[PDB]
């Protein structure tokens, strides 16, 4: 029964004098609900889930203001980072930021996080204890010093410990129908003779939620982790997820292979065999 809320911010500079693009999106679990895009027409925190629309005029100002303040600080960061790494004003550069909170089966604080990247790699990160900083290079250290002096850790802490958890709850309660649902995988198995010798067996998990899951083939006892083609779990586009795992086998030996499906949403881990 664990839940989280995470925000994700990306800022990308443009060659020359052009304004940076800003994108923010927010998630409760595997469900996104807000977004902001500098490129888009509104100029506001726009809702992305139905149940967040219950929020009133003021709510939308607050998050609009707060997202613009987030953007103004990303805009400036890029300038500073372009300096700390003495990089020409020519190339594109990316700042990403992520923060959020987790509560457990009982809606009390579990953990919080705040992480910052520059150019696709760690730059500065709030530690688990939420009190101090890991700095990934002497430029991050300049920041680390600046952030200590302004008590940034205690500030985000308070946020992560306070309002972050309290809002997570309100969302859990007001998007009840979406957010606290468990969807077990709808499963099936496909078989295709791929030569005289061998066949493909493909085990599918469809329309599951949350996204976490394990599909693993076994032959007889010990398992096939190596000879398996597995895709990474993927959004269906309707708020659920798909995954599959395949294995190639000798024709007439398919009864020897078994697919294991684990998911919070199944009381017992399903096992599947090609049973045509």
């Amino acid at each position: 029964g664990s839940h989280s809320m995470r925000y994700f911010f990306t800022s990308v500079s443009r060659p020359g004098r052009g304004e940076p693009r800003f994108i923010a999106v927010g998630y409760v679990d595997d469900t996104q609900f807000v977004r902001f895009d500098s490129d888009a027409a509104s100029q506001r925190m726009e809702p992305r889930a139905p149940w967040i629309e219950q929020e009133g005029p003021e709510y939308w100002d607050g998050e609009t203001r707060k997202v613009k303040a987030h953007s103004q600080t990303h805009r400036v960061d890029l300038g500073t980072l372009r300096g700390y790494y003495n990089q020409s004003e020519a190339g594109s550069h990316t700042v990403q930021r992520m923060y959020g909170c987790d509560v457990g089966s009982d809606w009390r604080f579990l953990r919080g996080y705040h992480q910052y990247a520059y150019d696709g790699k760690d730059y500065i990160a709030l530690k688990e204890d939420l009190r101090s900083w890991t700095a990934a290079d002497m430029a991050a250290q300049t920041t680390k010093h600046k952030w200590e002096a302004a008590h940034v850790a205690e500030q985000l802490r308070a946020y992560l410990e306070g309002t972050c958890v309290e809002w997570l709850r309100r969302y859990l309660e007001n998007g009840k129908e979406t957010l606290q649902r468990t969807d077990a995988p709808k499963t099936h198995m496909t078989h295709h003779a791929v030569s005289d010798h061998e066949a493909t067996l493909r085990c599918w998990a469809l329309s599951f939620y949350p996204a976490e899951i394990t599909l693993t083939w076994q032959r007889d006892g010990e398992d096939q982790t190596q000879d398996t083609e597995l895709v990474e779990t993927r959004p269906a586009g309707d708020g659920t997820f798909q995954k599959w795992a395949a294995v190639v086998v000798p024709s007439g030996q398919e009864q020897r292979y078994t697919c294991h499906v684990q998911h919070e949403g199944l009381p017992k881990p399903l096992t599947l065999r090609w049973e045509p």
Partner: peptide
């Protein structure tokens, strides 16, 4: 709910 504090320049 975006934090209103804790975000300042690097």
């Amino acid at each position: 709910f975006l934090t209103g504090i804790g975000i300042i320049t690097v």
